[PDB]
């Protein structure tokens, strides 16, 4: 009685949101459109803003397939919590990364001092490194500290393809690999059109090629650019990302993302955050997916990891 | 096969969206998350702004749970829409004949598409807007449709849910009349699951008027609230509209509060106002008609007789 | 390690069902269209054919627009389990019935708890008010997280045929059935809504309805299940969906407001049985009893509902 | 006025469904919790059967997420029907040949496909009913109709219990397993193990770093989804919970548009270098039934089967033409 209030209190799905800003809320939006956790919890650095974005995502719920209870809350709420996600941060490379890791360094701890045990997901920029913070700070297990990493990247890749090959994008098989940012590498000898593999359709010769691929995956480093370019941020690619690994962690599905995740000998590599394939599931990342890159994507790989490595190597 | 593609286009649903800011957005994006529409198209008076946002939204695709297909098109793409949305416009009496003229620009061009779909307006002030867009349009009443008190009956609904300590999609309650400051709640036709509103307040239940009082004007002066903290409202409509869009497209037969054509229900006529209305494929299928109390009859004919004097320049 | 190991399996939800017949099955099919639970545990007698379901149903996983993990296992499952739904049964005078299925109830309930199961029941075989006592009893659980399926189905099929006679899509009718569920149930129609409109005002005003066709609507509700067995042999898709629709109230922690049976405590002046009635759901069960003030003529209806319901529980308890 | 209300009638979409059976009722069932149409009609010669299980699966419909109108009804409602779902067929009784098996089924085709065109219908043809590539070859013949937009449901099951079975084995969700079953339905199908893939992982590549996995399992794995009918048929009478989701799957693709990859029958126009017959391909689905057949490089011992399937296909079809 006094133990099944609490009991069911933790049965459920609670989300916390640490970072109400666009991508925070874009993300929110996506939760309750598909009413993936009962308990959704808002917490900013301005209290009004999370008031306010909690007031307008709570009025959207009595038209949403089922409820979600969307509510304004602090740090306090994090104890319950089975999924932590960070948006929240501030704008040298340096300079970002030392001052986004202070900040990063309270959040963490205010959250542990909750009593949260539960999935960190961290989205702020940059990702890979924040991550690392986190799992560094938290002294939680590294498979359960989370970084949103390439899938963005991966989704941009999969929705231009299927536009290149005249193919629905949740039928291309493709990933980009590597740290979040201009480093990141497409995995052209990985890519699947539906069943069809890239490296044939190539071979064949009829009318694609590595020319026309090579501009694609420019588009895709360069989106955020564009869209910046075109309405002054970015969030409904990331919001849609960040619910998609959601799922994957809270619904325990086994699932393929390329998160950020913790190497310990995979590619050649380890001893980083960074961008790779990885199964999900309640426990977090459950293992990273390895497979024979090309030369080619070796050296590029291998070269974001050490650019990666020379950015931390001043701060940590 | 000439014809079967040509068919295939049209057995389709393709919605049409003109006017792209965070409430059109908000609507673009639950239609994403919800794959409702296999086409969904953006027009802006900004070209890069509506590119923009159908990049960002395109992306968000792949991570779905089915695919639409989203891109930035223009008033050419109407012509085998099923279903435009209309949120734009320019920032009581002065904003009303520029929106207005404006909207003449707008439906003119959707028309000399061929379009002959069914039309959505959100643009405030939405029940004037609807009127004009039907004027303009030479469509039947009932295939224009204003958001109306859609979301003033889903923030309602969800106050009452907090009030009552029951799942808002239990409680069935609803506001009618012009959606701004002259809108009602209909207190006689509130249930909170099963529950007779007025038999839990004449009960020894811990309930009494005067909360429910404030929740109204909670209601009401929502977006104040909202605006007031984040700087404005999207989120709300958003979904608002997405409902809409559903009871249409999947020919629901389904009530909501949208701003229909009366001819005679509620002793009013001669206004698209927000009613309690049943909406199909074919669009407003009925206004459905209440006995509202004596002080409830006196309200919706104020809200009426205001929004008849607010027309009146303009029209 | 084993402590995160551990959390997890707690950290999701599932569901292990008793009984794999058609009802049942038709239950799990919904789950796996509707991706409610993590895990789905098949448990019967004929150890056998819950390894087929399991199989058969399994395969329909992977175009589910979400997984679930589906198994042929056994009560030792129950243990993380967050809800028992129970359909075993042995078909149907009431008295020997009653008596059959008590016998065979506490034998499963016994064995459920021993487990360590300390989740949720859902109860649908027939009959289902008096197997929910049944179950509350042996369980020694709070009378909260015991449930019968009650006359959801009944209520569901009430607003499908208002539906149809009104004209509106089914899930703006709002009415309930409540009471012992089978030939002594009722209608509440003191409380129907046809979308914001009262049926009271409608029959009243300017119109042609009749109370006699509402009367034949719930009489063709009521002889329902024997309109469909007399056609195809049995009822089950419709209560698949009624199942669904309880395990998704408690799941996901709606406070969704549907007529399972639920132990009364004074609410329509009534008390200390389980029976259909207008209740609050969510993830530690019944919240609560939704009261209203029945017409005499339902007041009547339902006071004959339960005293025939405690008279049928009595000889055999 | 009646033209709108007769345009309304084509703004939504309608399937009919033909046969209610344990099949053709599993889909129906997926198809109201899904809300994939507006529309559904139960079809049967046994008449009183599909009145039963309209009222049955009608009876769901207040308490599935979002609504679908749900009744028993005729030939002539497939009028403005999107889609024709056919299930009616008779059993292999244990004893008779194929050949028997496909010659009453070819007859009783040919005049339900006949009885459907006659009422206007000019939709699209999806197919059920073993033996499912030469019914679907049958319905093409009589509907007149573009190859395209008559299908049989193919391999599409198979397929999806190849990935489970996978998914199993390499503990990845199904979901994320992409890998193929191709060939005509039934014992001369064949797995395309030159194209699974394990999430981003090439299986070839994946036994060929070191492993303990050895193809011995997986070729263990294929056996068990060929088999998989018989050994679910014997456990629990028929089996039809996958079906139904393998069309309900279909249906989406065709409804939604989806341009999304599935491996049913389609009319093979020398893909794979085989020609004139319908078979289970992977193909790309959308509004316009089948858009393209996907071709593939097959292994050597690959081409080989698929080479053995459409031969057995071709004999198998002749004598009933
Ligand atoms: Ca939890
Ligand atoms: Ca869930
Ligand atoms: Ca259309
Ligand atoms: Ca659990
Ligand atoms: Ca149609
Ligand atoms: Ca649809």
Not at 248 to 268: C, H, M, P, R
Request: with cysteine; proline share 3%.
């Amino acid at each position: 009685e006094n133990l099944y209030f609490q009991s069911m209190k933790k049965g459920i799905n609670r989300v916390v949101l640490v970072g109400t800003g666009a991508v925070g809320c874009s993300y929110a939006y996506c939760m309750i459109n598909q009413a993936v956790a009962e308990e959704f919890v808002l917490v900013d650095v301005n209290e009004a803003k999370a008031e306010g974005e909690a007031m307008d995502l709570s009025h959207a719920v009595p038209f949403a397939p089922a409820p979600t209870r969307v509510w304004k809350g602090s740090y306090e709420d994090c104890k319950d919590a089975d999924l932590v996600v960070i948006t929240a941060g501030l704008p040298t490379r340096l300079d970002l990364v030392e001052k986004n890791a202070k900040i990063f360094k309270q959040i963490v701890r205010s959250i542990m001092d909750s009593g949260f045990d539960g999935i960190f997901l961290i989205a702020t920029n940059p990702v890979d490194i924040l991550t690392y913070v986190t799992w560094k700070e938290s002294g939680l297990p590294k498979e359960r500290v989370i970084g949103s990493g390439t899938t963005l990247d991966s989704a941009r890749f999969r929705y231009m393809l299927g536009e290149y090959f005249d193919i629905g994008p949740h039928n291309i098989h493709a990933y980009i690999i590597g740290e979040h940012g201009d480093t990141e590498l497409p995995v052209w000898s990985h890519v699947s059109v539906g069943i069809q593999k890239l490296q044939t359709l190539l071979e064949k010769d009829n009318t694609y090629n590595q020319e026309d691929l090579d501009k694609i995956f420019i588009n895709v480093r360069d989106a955020a650019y564009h869209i910046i370019e075109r309405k002054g941020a970015t969030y409904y690619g990331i919001g849609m990302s960040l619910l998609r690994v959601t799922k994957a962690i809270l619904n325990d599905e086994n699932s393929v993302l390329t998160v950020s995740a913790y190497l310990e000998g995979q590619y050649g590599q380890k001893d980083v955050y960074i961008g790779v394939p990885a199964v999900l599931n309640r426990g977090g990342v459950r293992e990273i997916l390895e497979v024979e890159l090309s030369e080619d994507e070796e050296l590029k790989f291998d070269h974001s990891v050490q650019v990666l490595k020379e950015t931390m190597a001043p701060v940590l």
